[PDB]
Design a protein around this ligand. Sequence first.
Ligand code: NI
Length: 341
Amino acid sequence: TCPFYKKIPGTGFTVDAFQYGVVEGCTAYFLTHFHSDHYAGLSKHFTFPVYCSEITGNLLKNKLHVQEQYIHPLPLDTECIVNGVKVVLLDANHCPGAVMILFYLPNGTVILHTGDFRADPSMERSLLADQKVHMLYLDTTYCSPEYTFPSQQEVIRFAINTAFEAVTLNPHALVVCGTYSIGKEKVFLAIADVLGSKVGMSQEKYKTLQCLNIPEINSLITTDMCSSLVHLLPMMQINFKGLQSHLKKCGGKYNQILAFRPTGWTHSNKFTRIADVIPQTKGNISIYGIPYSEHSSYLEMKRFVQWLKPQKIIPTVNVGTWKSRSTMEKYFREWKLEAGY
Ligand code: NI
């Protein structure tokens, strides 16, 4: 049955609640982004209204075959009316088409649901600045002080410099990047741009990327693997066996692989600077795990909440254990006492 933290009080609305069958009293189902833990349950047989971003709506139609008459895309940063309630969609700085949702309840309560997000000071100047928020449904993925990670910009600099150096030293090296959902496209696109190559990939993955409104995408991606020196493979294949096998398939065009696994966090972060990251190597294969996160660090999350000053926080992640829940509630209290709300 649907958990309380997916229900918006005082409306007929749910958020990211598609795996519970027909939710009792739900008149409109919102989807914050196209990741499988959130969309789980949607298909061509869904006949309730789905409200989402334009990009998420492209993906529902093309990848899951949801019928167009039930997809209701909304523009960002625009006040819209849904079943008599004002809503706004804001950029979540997660994966393409990911949004936060502001709901303006008829009785005066204002609720922000972050979906999945990576908090950023740029958010402190959207339509959020313009009113008070009473309840925050918060993406608490990394809500513990051990979770520090570098900026996205520092991580991409490291990747670009690493790949450019390797291929310049050996023009017969192949770069591989792992993927299993949308998100983190900058990793493979920045590397291909510095190498003067397109990124080669499966037809299924190319179709997925063509749904995303990325400008100049016909310019950066391709299904012709033979013309590309940056290949995308499933994340599961980014290991020594999987990569040895791929290299065999390239028919002696290449004699070395440099591979990237963009992870969220890895406890190498508690000891190591980005500058200091080294690969795992076997033979002519090296694998770099890089800490490219599309969720808030603890400090980014804390700054956002201490700026917003909500009256009540409802965590949406790590809510399944009493120890996790208790830990998070203790940090929320600290934040509030330190800031004075
Ligand atoms: Ni997500």
